[PDB]
A = this chain, B = another copy of it.
Amino acid sequence: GFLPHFQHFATQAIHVGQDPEQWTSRAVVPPISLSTTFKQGASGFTYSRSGNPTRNCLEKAVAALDGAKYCLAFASGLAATVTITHLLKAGDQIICMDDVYGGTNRYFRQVASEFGLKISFVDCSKIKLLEAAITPETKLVWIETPTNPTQKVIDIEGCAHIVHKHGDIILVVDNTFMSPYFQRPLALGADISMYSATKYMNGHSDVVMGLVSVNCESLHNRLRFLQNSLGAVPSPIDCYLCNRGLKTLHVRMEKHFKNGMAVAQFLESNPWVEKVIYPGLPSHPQHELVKRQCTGCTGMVTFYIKGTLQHAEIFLKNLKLFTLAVSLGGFESLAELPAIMTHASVLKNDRDVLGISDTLIRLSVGLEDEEDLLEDLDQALKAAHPP
């Protein structure tokens, strides 16, 4: 009952920007151009930071996958976030989601706010509340869906709609969790589709990178200027590796879905799980919303284990397939306790409100055999709660 899959995604991920006629060798795979500078004198490239062959191939590919006209690659997701924020002036205000990635939370609240920028954390799941926070000084709205890690889902089309009623306000959707294979914020009314390519996009846990796709011509020109002016650019080798990862994004995300769905269903029917949060499950508060704006779900499964902090640790330390580590979206399965780990960078009084207790566990289900993933979870839960 999900949105129909995007019509040329696999084809484009493999060929867009990859045209062999670009190179004198007619190579089927684009060469890695490390060169910082390029010969001028008799069009073309001037300096690597402003633009370079391998990065441009990647940006054109990602643009296509987002259904965008333009895309910009960055040193990291946070670097992309910071660059986007530099679009504004001293005196402007940013409305940010209350449950956001810790680093995003940290930048807005602790760094950006001390340069004449106003920051308001607003529950944008309450779309009725967003309008109340909007002021004539609001220039940017930052949204993330699903949120990390409580995975609450936001109506992008509804939010874009509220935001665009008051003229020049920018709507940014952090699309790190889903990827453009499952969700296209720009097609849903967003102005900017932002990624941490470090996660699902690259999908191989070996590249730190950010991506920003956009349609507005003037917004692109401002973003392209800041990309070269701030210089938070990615390595050409990282660009190549990420572009290589995109080649299998469609077949990777499908297995994440199948494995994620299977893990979520196993966990929900398990007597030692208090509650499971997974958009693909009917038990999810926004399951029907997900189906309207998304073409599927990922391998990100959040759940509460029964008992105390003690049980969550025994569970995590007895896993043999899931690796106890931060980050997500890789081919390998990851497990994590946000209260102590990825979201220790979010205030304690805010964690109590968001639901990040000592028993909330975030899983990044990988591409291993389903059987083995379930068996690993079963054995580990039995370690915390033995027969």
Contact = CB atoms under 8 A, between A and B. Distances in A.
Contact of A35 (B14, B25, B89, B250): B25
Interface residues of A, number: 106
B110 A316 contact: no
Contact of A14 (B29, B110, B234, B366): B366
Contact of A26 (B21, B27, B44): B44
A219 interface: no
Number of copies: 4
A266 interface: no
A231 B326 contact: no
Taking chain A's interface residues, is the majority helix, strand, or loop, or is none over half, making it mixed? loop
Contacts of A90: 90, 114-116
A324 interface: yes
B233 A76 contact: yes
A30 B36 CA distance: 11
Contacts of A321: 11, 15
Nearest to A345: B229
A39 interface: yes
Given A21-B39, A28-B325, 11 more contacts: A18-B332, A20-B39, A27-B35, A28-B36, A75-B75, A76-B233, A79-B231, A111-B229, A115-B117, A247-B331, A251-B254
